[PDB]
Every structure is written in structure tokens, then in C-alpha cells.
Tab-separated table of C-alpha atoms in Angstrom:
chain	number	residue	atom	x	y	z
A	1	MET	CA	32.111	-31.776	-16.513
A	2	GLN	CA	30.919	-29.392	-19.218
A	3	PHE	CA	29.236	-26.050	-18.533
A	4	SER	CA	28.355	-22.822	-20.321
A	5	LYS	CA	28.668	-19.237	-19.141
A	6	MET	CA	25.804	-16.921	-19.981
A	7	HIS	CA	24.339	-13.612	-18.854
A	8	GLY	CA	21.003	-11.833	-18.865
A	9	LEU	CA	20.327	-8.305	-17.606
A	10	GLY	CA	22.751	-7.699	-14.745
A	11	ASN	CA	23.295	-11.393	-13.869
A	12	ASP	CA	25.862	-13.891	-15.126
A	13	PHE	CA	25.132	-17.615	-14.821
A	14	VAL	CA	26.997	-20.871	-15.142
A	15	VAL	CA	24.539	-23.252	-16.805
A	16	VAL	CA	24.949	-27.005	-16.601
A	17	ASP	CA	23.347	-29.854	-18.517
A	18	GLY	CA	22.143	-31.981	-15.632
A	19	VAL	CA	20.095	-34.137	-18.000
A	20	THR	CA	22.749	-36.079	-19.900
A	21	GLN	CA	25.093	-35.552	-16.941
A	22	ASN	CA	24.646	-36.496	-13.286
A	23	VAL	CA	25.642	-33.377	-11.400
A	24	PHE	CA	25.828	-32.543	-7.724
A	25	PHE	CA	27.425	-29.676	-5.846
A	26	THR	CA	27.790	-29.310	-2.100
A	27	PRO	CA	26.905	-25.752	-1.027
A	28	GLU	CA	30.648	-25.492	-0.403
A	29	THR	CA	31.669	-26.459	-3.930
A	30	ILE	CA	29.188	-23.940	-5.308
A	31	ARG	CA	30.705	-21.158	-3.210
A	32	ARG	CA	34.145	-22.117	-4.488
A	33	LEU	CA	33.041	-22.120	-8.132
A	34	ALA	CA	31.167	-18.820	-7.774
A	35	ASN	CA	34.317	-17.098	-6.465
A	36	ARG	CA	35.513	-14.740	-9.197
A	37	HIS	CA	39.159	-14.899	-8.207
A	38	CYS	CA	39.587	-18.625	-7.455
A	39	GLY	CA	36.644	-20.145	-9.326
A	40	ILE	CA	34.577	-19.732	-12.481
A	41	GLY	CA	32.812	-16.612	-11.241
A	42	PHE	CA	29.022	-16.137	-11.426
A	43	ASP	CA	25.985	-14.684	-9.643
A	44	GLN	CA	23.928	-17.881	-9.911
A	45	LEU	CA	24.191	-21.514	-10.959
A	46	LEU	CA	21.517	-23.058	-13.162
A	47	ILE	CA	21.111	-26.806	-13.594
A	48	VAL	CA	18.883	-28.162	-16.351
A	49	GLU	CA	17.317	-31.451	-15.192
A	50	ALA	CA	14.805	-34.103	-16.212
A	51	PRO	CA	11.243	-33.110	-15.289
A	52	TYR	CA	9.964	-36.546	-14.152
A	53	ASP	CA	6.685	-35.505	-15.748
A	54	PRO	CA	5.561	-36.620	-19.260
A	55	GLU	CA	3.822	-33.250	-19.730
A	56	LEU	CA	6.947	-31.094	-19.298
A	57	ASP	CA	10.158	-30.826	-21.304
A	58	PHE	CA	12.534	-29.811	-18.537
A	59	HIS	CA	13.025	-28.703	-14.995
A	60	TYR	CA	15.780	-26.461	-13.668
A	61	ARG	CA	17.141	-25.362	-10.323
A	62	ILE	CA	18.940	-22.167	-9.440
A	63	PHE	CA	21.566	-21.759	-6.733
A	64	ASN	CA	22.941	-18.472	-5.424
A	65	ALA	CA	26.621	-17.783	-4.732
A	66	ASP	CA	26.039	-18.975	-1.157
A	67	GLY	CA	25.291	-22.478	-2.408
A	68	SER	CA	21.594	-22.381	-1.497
A	69	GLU	CA	18.829	-23.388	-3.882
A	70	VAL	CA	16.476	-20.506	-4.639
A	71	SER	CA	13.048	-19.961	-6.172
A	72	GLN	CA	12.530	-16.687	-8.022
A	73	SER	CA	9.647	-16.729	-10.509
A	74	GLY	CA	11.083	-16.367	-14.002
A	75	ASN	CA	14.723	-15.938	-12.999
A	76	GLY	CA	17.168	-17.678	-15.319
A	77	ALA	CA	14.317	-18.654	-17.643
A	78	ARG	CA	15.767	-16.923	-20.695
A	79	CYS	CA	19.303	-18.249	-20.258
A	80	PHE	CA	17.789	-21.688	-19.738
A	81	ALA	CA	15.772	-21.493	-22.946
A	82	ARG	CA	18.742	-20.396	-25.063
A	83	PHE	CA	20.996	-23.035	-23.492
A	84	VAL	CA	18.750	-26.016	-24.229
A	85	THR	CA	18.300	-24.674	-27.758
A	86	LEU	CA	21.996	-24.067	-28.487
A	87	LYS	CA	22.988	-27.424	-26.998
A	88	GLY	CA	20.370	-29.324	-28.996
A	89	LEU	CA	18.640	-30.649	-25.870
A	90	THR	CA	15.422	-29.680	-27.652
A	91	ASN	CA	14.342	-28.090	-30.941
A	92	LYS	CA	10.798	-26.975	-30.096
A	93	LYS	CA	9.839	-23.302	-30.266
A	94	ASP	CA	7.627	-23.587	-27.187
A	95	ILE	CA	9.263	-25.224	-24.189
A	96	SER	CA	7.435	-26.315	-21.046
A	97	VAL	CA	9.566	-26.132	-17.939
A	98	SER	CA	9.041	-26.380	-14.202
A	99	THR	CA	10.986	-24.566	-11.519
A	100	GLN	CA	11.062	-25.236	-7.799
A	101	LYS	CA	7.978	-23.017	-7.434
A	102	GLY	CA	5.877	-23.246	-10.595
A	103	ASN	CA	5.645	-23.852	-14.334
A	104	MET	CA	6.263	-21.763	-17.431
A	105	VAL	CA	6.154	-21.994	-21.194
A	106	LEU	CA	9.033	-20.348	-23.021
A	107	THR	CA	9.093	-19.265	-26.634
A	108	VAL	CA	12.291	-18.700	-28.562
A	109	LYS	CA	11.358	-15.745	-30.759
A	110	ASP	CA	12.506	-15.388	-34.357
A	111	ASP	CA	14.501	-12.305	-33.336
A	112	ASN	CA	16.403	-14.580	-30.947
A	113	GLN	CA	14.786	-13.161	-27.804
A	114	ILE	CA	12.988	-15.268	-25.230
A	115	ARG	CA	9.303	-14.730	-24.503
A	116	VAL	CA	8.185	-16.116	-21.153
A	117	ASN	CA	4.549	-16.921	-20.422
A	118	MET	CA	4.276	-15.947	-16.750
A	119	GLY	CA	0.608	-16.914	-16.583
A	120	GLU	CA	-2.277	-14.780	-15.360
A	121	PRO	CA	-1.599	-12.126	-12.674
A	122	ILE	CA	-3.335	-12.972	-9.377
A	123	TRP	CA	-5.328	-10.131	-7.791
A	124	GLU	CA	-7.411	-11.704	-5.003
A	125	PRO	CA	-5.778	-10.490	-1.752
A	126	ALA	CA	-5.986	-13.854	0.052
A	127	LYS	CA	-4.274	-15.624	-2.838
A	128	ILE	CA	-1.284	-13.277	-2.974
A	129	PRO	CA	-1.216	-13.564	0.076
A	130	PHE	CA	-2.023	-10.082	1.356
A	131	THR	CA	-4.241	-9.138	4.300
A	132	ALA	CA	-7.030	-6.826	3.120
A	133	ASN	CA	-10.829	-6.694	3.271
A	134	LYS	CA	-11.259	-6.721	-0.493
A	135	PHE	CA	-9.560	-6.014	-3.806
A	136	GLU	CA	-8.447	-2.442	-4.478
A	137	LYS	CA	-6.487	-0.865	-7.318
A	138	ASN	CA	-4.615	1.116	-4.648
A	139	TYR	CA	-4.134	-0.127	-1.075
A	140	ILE	CA	-3.210	2.067	1.887
A	141	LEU	CA	-0.186	0.630	3.696
A	142	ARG	CA	1.131	2.118	6.909
A	143	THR	CA	4.832	1.968	7.794
A	144	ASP	CA	6.745	3.489	10.724
A	145	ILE	CA	7.708	6.501	8.631
A	146	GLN	CA	5.113	6.973	5.912
A	147	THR	CA	1.770	5.765	4.633
A	148	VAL	CA	2.122	4.554	1.048
A	149	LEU	CA	-0.306	3.678	-1.736
A	150	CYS	CA	0.440	0.494	-3.604
A	151	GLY	CA	-0.917	-2.078	-5.975
A	152	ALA	CA	-0.591	-5.676	-4.776
A	153	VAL	CA	-0.445	-8.712	-7.051
A	154	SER	CA	1.002	-12.193	-7.508
A	155	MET	CA	2.936	-13.638	-10.451
A	156	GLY	CA	3.397	-16.809	-8.433
A	157	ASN	CA	5.373	-14.818	-5.872
A	158	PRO	CA	3.976	-11.836	-3.865
A	159	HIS	CA	4.413	-8.246	-5.035
A	160	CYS	CA	3.869	-4.751	-3.684
A	161	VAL	CA	4.128	-1.942	-6.251
A	162	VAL	CA	4.668	1.662	-5.165
A	163	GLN	CA	4.837	4.509	-7.686
A	164	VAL	CA	7.582	7.094	-7.211
A	165	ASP	CA	8.436	10.470	-8.767
A	166	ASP	CA	12.185	9.849	-9.253
A	167	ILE	CA	13.489	6.282	-9.314
A	168	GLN	CA	16.987	7.334	-8.185
A	169	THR	CA	15.908	9.202	-5.052
A	170	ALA	CA	13.085	6.841	-4.050
A	171	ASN	CA	13.506	5.709	-0.442
A	172	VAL	CA	14.104	2.059	-1.329
A	173	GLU	CA	16.693	1.770	1.454
A	174	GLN	CA	14.107	2.390	4.207
A	175	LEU	CA	10.738	1.596	2.633
A	176	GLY	CA	11.981	-1.577	0.970
A	177	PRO	CA	12.651	-3.415	4.271
A	178	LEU	CA	9.518	-1.983	5.889
A	179	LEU	CA	7.370	-3.213	3.011
A	180	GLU	CA	9.232	-6.467	2.307
A	181	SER	CA	8.529	-7.629	5.856
A	182	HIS	CA	5.261	-5.805	6.489
A	183	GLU	CA	2.771	-7.655	8.692
A	184	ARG	CA	-0.036	-7.456	6.135
A	185	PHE	CA	2.080	-9.645	3.840
A	186	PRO	CA	1.977	-13.039	5.670
A	187	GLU	CA	4.679	-14.626	3.514
A	188	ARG	CA	6.645	-11.390	3.003
A	189	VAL	CA	6.722	-9.453	-0.283
A	190	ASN	CA	8.809	-8.186	-3.192
A	191	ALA	CA	8.627	-4.375	-2.948
A	192	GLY	CA	8.731	-2.585	-6.279
A	193	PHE	CA	9.334	1.130	-6.836
A	194	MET	CA	8.070	2.290	-10.198
A	195	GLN	CA	8.635	5.573	-11.994
A	196	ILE	CA	6.277	5.905	-14.941
A	197	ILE	CA	7.993	7.724	-17.836
A	198	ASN	CA	5.015	7.288	-20.190
A	199	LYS	CA	2.286	4.708	-20.842
A	200	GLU	CA	4.724	2.359	-22.536
A	201	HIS	CA	7.871	2.921	-20.479
A	202	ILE	CA	8.811	2.653	-16.807
A	203	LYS	CA	11.904	2.503	-14.636
A	204	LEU	CA	11.851	0.013	-11.809
A	205	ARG	CA	13.767	-0.874	-8.639
A	206	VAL	CA	12.887	-3.906	-6.565
A	207	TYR	CA	13.639	-4.829	-2.988
A	208	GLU	CA	13.361	-8.589	-3.386
A	209	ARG	CA	11.828	-10.739	-0.689
A	210	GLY	CA	14.632	-11.884	1.600
A	211	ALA	CA	17.383	-10.607	-0.689
A	212	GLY	CA	16.933	-6.872	-0.991
A	213	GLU	CA	17.680	-4.864	-4.108
A	214	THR	CA	19.528	-6.423	-7.055
A	215	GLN	CA	20.270	-5.647	-10.720
A	216	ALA	CA	17.038	-7.151	-12.055
A	217	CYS	CA	13.889	-8.888	-10.846
A	218	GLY	CA	11.867	-10.149	-13.799
A	219	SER	CA	8.771	-11.184	-11.853
A	220	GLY	CA	8.981	-7.688	-10.398
A	221	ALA	CA	8.876	-6.088	-13.852
A	222	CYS	CA	5.822	-8.231	-14.574
A	223	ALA	CA	3.998	-7.186	-11.400
A	224	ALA	CA	4.772	-3.482	-11.850
A	225	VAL	CA	3.366	-3.458	-15.381
A	226	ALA	CA	0.340	-5.516	-14.348
A	227	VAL	CA	-0.478	-3.062	-11.562
A	228	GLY	CA	0.049	-0.043	-13.799
A	229	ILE	CA	-2.248	-1.491	-16.457
A	230	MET	CA	-4.854	-2.362	-13.827
A	231	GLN	CA	-4.757	1.246	-12.595
A	232	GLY	CA	-5.106	2.549	-16.138
A	233	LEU	CA	-1.741	4.293	-16.056
A	234	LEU	CA	-0.095	1.975	-18.582
A	235	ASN	CA	-0.769	0.517	-22.017
A	236	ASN	CA	-0.612	-3.215	-22.729
A	237	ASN	CA	2.973	-3.362	-24.022
A	238	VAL	CA	5.565	-1.774	-21.737
A	239	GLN	CA	9.338	-1.432	-21.663
A	240	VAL	CA	10.680	-1.862	-18.136
A	241	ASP	CA	14.114	-0.442	-17.320
A	242	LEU	CA	15.698	-2.318	-14.438
A	243	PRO	CA	19.174	-1.437	-13.174
A	244	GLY	CA	20.645	-4.322	-15.174
A	245	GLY	CA	18.722	-3.587	-18.366
A	246	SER	CA	15.371	-3.615	-20.145
A	247	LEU	CA	12.507	-6.078	-20.506
A	248	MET	CA	9.350	-5.921	-22.588
A	249	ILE	CA	6.094	-6.808	-20.841
A	250	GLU	CA	2.820	-7.630	-22.608
A	251	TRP	CA	-0.541	-8.170	-20.901
A	252	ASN	CA	-4.019	-7.938	-22.416
A	253	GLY	CA	-5.815	-7.796	-19.073
A	254	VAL	CA	-7.910	-10.159	-16.961
A	255	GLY	CA	-8.478	-13.547	-18.562
A	256	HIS	CA	-5.115	-13.277	-20.329
A	257	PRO	CA	-1.655	-14.455	-19.334
A	258	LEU	CA	1.177	-11.938	-18.955
A	259	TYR	CA	4.335	-12.268	-21.070
A	260	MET	CA	7.872	-11.156	-20.246
A	261	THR	CA	10.368	-10.813	-23.090
A	262	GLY	CA	14.101	-10.285	-22.985
A	263	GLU	CA	17.557	-11.373	-24.082
A	264	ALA	CA	19.904	-14.156	-22.994
A	265	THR	CA	23.519	-14.267	-24.178
A	266	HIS	CA	25.886	-17.207	-24.481
A	267	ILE	CA	29.463	-16.257	-23.603
A	268	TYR	CA	31.661	-19.385	-23.685
A	269	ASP	CA	31.760	-23.139	-22.958
A	270	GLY	CA	33.893	-24.623	-20.234
A	271	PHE	CA	35.232	-27.889	-18.906
A	272	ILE	CA	36.150	-28.376	-15.280
A	273	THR	CA	36.846	-31.520	-13.288
A	274	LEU	CA	35.410	-31.191	-9.787
């Protein structure tokens, strides 16, 4: 079996062509391959598959080191786009792809970066889902230790964005869990902590739904910028600094889709018989 190793902002993936190859991995095999000392070594596994839909170009699944399939809006999108391009699985500039959760359109920029069309941000509370009487630019959320103000929005997945003075000392450890599993968020939520440096630059930390804080949560960068723009604290093109690295977010407001742009790097190609 052939595979490629790639990385994008804090995460390193093993990407496999599951289109021209029939691939299957027991959760066990995945755990073995993810092991950095006895296996290939990687944070997540990405399989490119047929879409079984004449309107899409591809589909792809992501598995964590535990061998479980996961659905994180936008995750692995850039590595996927560069992989199908490099491997000649497609030659289009705009690629339609579906993930376990939703759909996306990827654009391979001339500068070699990947621009992801994340669609229009969803504000209606009920559609997030988030329990609230009506829409608000800033919602009052009570937690056992503090009442916080936050913007709430959906990029397919639920988001809670709290602004903080200093990203390094923000109480992510305690507020993250309290927000992530707050009652007013029926299906749980991704809790973002945003420090605004200026109208076109922010630093972000995310306590991902069910996974906690990691090196980078793209959909989180999207939500944070969307909220900031909605509140009038940010311009329409913003650089987001996640722990793993930076992303560029562009959103022209309601009626427009939000774009997320970043890099994806090919490292090497491998062959392994399972």
C-alpha cells in the first residue's frame, strides 16, 4: 500500500489514496501505525475516497490516533487538496469534497496555498444549536466560577467565542470544560479564547468539543473571526495565530461565505504492506 506523509499547522497526517486503492484499517491497525516508535507516526489518518455523488469530486475520512473516525469541520482539508493535486487524482483548481459532516469547495491558490470555502456562518441560536431567546452579538453565559460574554456561531459545528486580554494566561483549563459542556449548548461546543492584537490579527486557543485543546482548530479560527467581525472589532481579512501556526480568514459579512486559507506540506511518500 502506498501513502504520503504531510503536515499542516501543528498536525502531521498520513494520507492514503482510497480511490484507486481499496483500503481498510481496524481501529487496532490504525493505533499501531500512528505509534511514533513502532509505526509510521502521525496525529491523524486521512483517506481520500470516491464520493458516490456525481456532483462531488471526492470524499475523505479522518481517523485519530485512537483509530476512531472523526468529524472536524475543515480539518485535513488543505492536506487533502494538495495530495489529490500532487498525485494527479484531479487537475481542477476548485475541488468539491464531502466530509463525514458536510461539504466544502477547495481552491488551490497560485501561491500554492489552499483556500477553503467554509460556507456562510450560522448565527440563529436554534441552528447552532444554542439555547437563547434571540440573537445577540454578545451572550451572557454563567459558569460555576465566572459569568462570561461570548459570541456564538456555527461553521457547521458549534462555537463559543470568548475574548481574553492575554492568550497565554486565559483560563482555558477551567473555562474550556465548563463552556464545552455547558447546558445551553445542547450538542456541546468548541470554546474559543481570542486575544485581539489589532483589527487584522488575533491569537486564538480552542478547547475543542470532546477533545480539549490542541495545536490548531481551523473551524475555530473561522468562528472567532466571524464573531469579531460581527461585533465590529475586526476587519474582513484577519490573520489568526493558533498554537500550531497561522491561518488567513476572509469574510465579507452576511450573505457571503467565509474563507479559510493556509498551507499544506508534502513530506515524503511511503510503501507499507499491512
